Design a protein around this ligand. Sequence first.
Ligand SMILES: [Ca+2]
Ligand SMILES: [Ca+2]
Ligand SMILES: [Ca+2]
Ligand SMILES: [Ca+2]
Length: 393
Amino acid sequence: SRRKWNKTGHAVRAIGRLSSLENVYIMADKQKNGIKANFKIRHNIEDRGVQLAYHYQQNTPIGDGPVLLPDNHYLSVQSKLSKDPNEKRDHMVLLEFVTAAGITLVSKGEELFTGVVPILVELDGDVNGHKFSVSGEGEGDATYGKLTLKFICTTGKLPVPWPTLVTTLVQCFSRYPDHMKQHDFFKSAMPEGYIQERTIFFKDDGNYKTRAEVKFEGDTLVNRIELKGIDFKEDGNILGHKLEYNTRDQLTEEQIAEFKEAFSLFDKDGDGTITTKELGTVMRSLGQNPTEAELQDMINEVDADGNGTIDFPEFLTMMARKMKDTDSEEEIREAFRVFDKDGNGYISAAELRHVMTNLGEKLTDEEVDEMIREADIDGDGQVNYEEFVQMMT
Ligand SMILES: [Ca+2]
Ligand SMILES: [Ca+2]
Ligand SMILES: [Ca+2]
Ligand SMILES: [Ca+2]
C-alpha cells in the first residue's frame, strides 16, 4: 500500500531523533560551585518551519551550605500550554513534567520537596526596549516532576510570544530517580537557593539574557527574573508574533499504530525493546556505520528507565515528541540524503528500492513504482526535496 512510506518515513525520522540532542544537558561546574547547562528549544512557526532557540545556562548557590555537584545527565521536559477561557488578560496556563535521566543502572533540601509546594514567579523584561512584566503562580510536585502554573502579563499585551518565555519562567521541581539522587543540585541548594543565568539565542534573530533568583520565601518557592533582549527584528518570528501557541495535539490511534510499525523494523526479534545491536543492524543496512559507543549514546538520549535499551513505551514517547516538534531544514535534508544516495537532488525509482530492500522488505516493481507514483507531485517520475517534505507530513 502507501503506508510503506509512513513506516520507513518514521524509521528515518527515528534515527534523526536518536542522532540529535534534545534534552537539558547538565554538567558540574566546580569553579562556580554549581552546574552548567545547555539545550536547544524548537518553537513551531505558524504554518511551517521551526524557530530554534539555543540555551546556555549557569547556576550558583546563594548560600554556603554544602551542595551536590552532579555527573553529566539530562532533564527531559514535557510542556503543555493552554488558555484559561475565563481569562480576559494576556496569560498562559502551563502544565509541565520533568524527569532526570541519562545515567544507566540524598540532600537535606530534598526534604523540602516531598509534598506539594506553592510557587510564585516574578519576571521583568525588556526586549529591544519593549518592556513588560509577567506574574505567575501555582504548585510544584517534585515527586512526579509536576508543575502547574498560570502566568499573567501584568503590563498588558506581551510583546514576545508566550512560548519563548517558558524556559525562563524552577528545575528544583524535577523528579530525580532513586539512583540519581546524589546528582540533584537544585534541591540541594534549598532553602537559600541559586542564581540561574542564561543566554538564549534565537537563530537568525536576537538573544535574551536572563538572571533569576530561585529560593524559598517562607513556604513558597519563588523565582524572580530579569530579562533583557537585544538584536531582535521587528518583523522576525518573536517580535512579529509568528510562533504557534498550541502544543500540537495528542495522538491518534492511527498515529500510535504507525509508530509501532516503525518500532518493529528495529525490534527484529519482537521482544518489545530495541538493543544497541538491533539499532546497529538498521543503521548499517541504511548506509551509516556507527560504533558501539555511539549506539549506547543514542539509546541513552531516550532511555527513560536507564536499562540501556529503548523500550516500546520509551520509543512512543520519543516519536510523540518528534512529531510535536518540527524538524529544521538541515535535518530534513539529511533525511533526504539517506534516499538520494548519489546526491543528484532526486530520489530515483532505483534508489527507493535500494533502501527498502536493505530495510528488510521485498517489494515488487509496481509496488516500488507505486510509492514513487504517490509522491510525484509534478510528475518527473522522481521525488525532489519539495515533494519529499510534503510527504513527510
Ligand atoms: Ca529486540
Ligand atoms: Ca529503557
Ligand atoms: Ca538520486
Ligand atoms: Ca517529481
